[PDB]
Subunit: 112 residues, 4 copies
């Protein structure tokens, strides 16, 4: 699994479940091509986005729909979405995001 | 000053100086129009981006150029940039301060919204 | 002002006002001596804790009373308090600004150290 | 496993390995009694700190020795250690910490 995303809720101290996200790859013309999407599981994780053969080097954007997550919990948030934009480099990627209504953090753990 | 950005460097324990950022506003056709741009000062702040009159309701994207920042210091970071996307002014004018704390493989961003 | 603390609330997008904090300095016998205390203002800042003369080298603990803060708002948080422990002034006097961003189950803290 | 700790390094984008920590329980006289300790594994995790029978309600402190971690990497950090102080309440606890030299964040995920 080359690319995994994990989302945590800082208000409830829980996995952020049923959070939608879309992954985009940057195309030669600088537009964002849909690449992969899904919703986090009960453990706040989204696995199976892509495969090692498909996940070639390039710039990707993960757009996490944080606004709908907070709306379904009855809480007005600041951001429209969270965006994590990175280059995938051949020299496993776990993207993590901690959500608060007016703040979020994101970190990448890149391992073997 | 209705929209200010402050950036901090978590490796050095200092303001993040000379960080470039581009602000965009979503147009009627769903594209991102350029709105304002600038770079942080020696206190890590960027003031004067826009005015109360020009900062009307809309969806704004602050794109902070973190990769350029870290590269200029010889560090190869993870992200291309930090993106802060939010609806502004949709219950009347507010003042926004967006903060970002930068590490090479992580960042955090928060907004303080006053009236 | 050699030691300032700024606290932000990540649920409300605001300064964290009336947050109490106690600063301790490690004594020769390895115990924590009370050093200064105060509470944040309406801008979420606490200034005037100490003076250049009194803030000598040592190991300091800033204990931020986050549980009292959240409880006063009807939220049951996870932490008792946020603790920031650091050696100060050990290459000469510096100015420290400690920031903390508070959520009910998480917090972050950063220091900016100037000379 | 009632109590797990996970530590991540924000400079290298990696698990923080071989990080020492000690866990204390608050005693009736307000002192901190040693309770459990260990070092994070290759995956940045420390499991097996305590058992469900021993982990009774009370106030605990996890002291993460972040200073020695940065020192062994040749980097001068700000904090002496990171401290996470919480009440364990019978109404599984995963404590996570993201380390930077001049900053850290910590979150709790409390699940069933
Ligand atoms: C918000 O703090 C947390 C947190 O509560 C849980 C976290 O869980 C993670 C789990 C992971 O497997 C991995 C990958 C580690 C490998 C060795 C592949 C993680 O990086 C995390 C977390 O980063 C994590 C975090 C910290 C992330 C933030 C504060 C954006
Ligand atoms: C939560 O992210 C914020 C934030 O929203 C506001 C912040 O305000 C600061 C103001 C400051 O003057 C200084 C000192 C900079 C000097 C040149 C002395 C700050 O460091 C901050 C912030 O740290 C700050 C932050 C980031 C702090 C976190 C993420 C714990
Ligand atoms: Br949008
Ligand atoms: Br640009
Ligand atoms: Br300047
Ligand atoms: Br890009
Ligand atoms: Br602010
Ligand atoms: Br006290
Ligand atoms: Br005041
Ligand atoms: Br306590
Ligand atoms: Br100490
Ligand atoms: Br977790």
């Amino acid at each position: 699994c080359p690319l995994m995303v994990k989302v945590l809720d800082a208000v409830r101290g829980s996995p952020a479940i049923n959070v939608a996200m879309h992954v985009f790859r940057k195309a030669a013309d600088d537009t964002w091509e849909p690449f992969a999407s899904g919703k986090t599981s009960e453990s706040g994780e989204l696995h199976g986005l892509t495969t090692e053969e498909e996940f070639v080097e390039g710039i990707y954007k993960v757009e996490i729909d944080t606004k709908s997550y907070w709306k379904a919990l009855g809480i007005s948030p600041f951001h429209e979405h969270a965006e994590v934009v990175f280059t995938a480099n051949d020299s496993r990627y776990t993207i993590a995001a901690l959500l608060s209504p007016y703040s979020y953090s994101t970190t990448a753990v890149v391992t073997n």
